[PDB]
Structure 1
């Protein structure tokens, strides 16, 4: 694009989670996930179970383990720190979380995100990706 007939620098989102399918949901039937989510939420009412998987086609390192049991008051920012270290990202490498394809505030708590976004199996689902954008 160019217009004021100067060109725009066009920025475009790439390899967003969008409506990604989690391997966890493919691998385990609903009743098994729901029973597990119910039981871990009863066992630890002040913690939330979270599935973390990579956005398809994200140009980013693999995550060894996908199932997290997190204090409800833990911030997104603190969870970023732990996940970056599990992936062994360089400080200069981008990492963004998406819940339902929306990047959450770093000061949000995992409990706030869970209360708003947990699925019917009582898990919170987080996709991670790189910057997921180009054009500059």
Structure 2
């Protein structure tokens, strides 16, 4: 009689493959150096959120203009995974859905980790950030 709820992603369960394959000191060195080389851009890691049903992202490392908006970055990722116009896409930054009106520079200055990278997870649904 019970509706079993077993298909929703655990909050905070996202694990970035980028951090499992690159130690902190290597990431921190590259992030700090790329921020000095391009002070008007931010380095971003984008990977698929848990239990998402959506196409794979071939590349995870992006150097984005700080003045690019989140809505424009949604546009970029949609094309790279070849989403249909009707397909949904959500971003998550520290377990929260960022405002589409924010700039990537605003997200970076608020949410970048100590390795100087900004981490974004993506999914076809919003559950992971609610």
Relative distance call for 1:15 and 1:124 in structure 2 (3 A) is: farther
Task: Give me the whole-angstrom Cα distance separating, in 1, the residues matched to 2:115 and 2:7.
Answer: 26
Output the aligned Cα RMSD. 3.2
The farther-off stretch of 13-22 and 32-41 is 13-22
TM-score by length of structure 1 reads 0.84
Bigger radius of gyration among the two: 1
Cα-to-partner distance string for 1:84-124 (whole Å, 9 max, x where unaligned): 00000111111000001111111100000000000000000
- Runs of 4+ deviating beyond 2 Å: 11-19, 132-136
Relative distance call for 1:81 and 1:135 in structure 2 (3 A) is: closer
Relative distance call for 1:23 and 1:55 in structure 2 (3 A) is: same
Between Structure 1 and Structure 2, how many residues are aligned?
A: 126
Relative distance call for 1:22 and 1:120 in structure 2 (3 A) is: same
Relative distance call for 1:76 and 1:12 in structure 2 (3 A) is: farther
TM-score by length of structure 2 reads 0.88
> Which stretches in structure 2 are left out of the alignment for 5+ residues?
none
2:96/2:129 contact within 8 Å kept: no
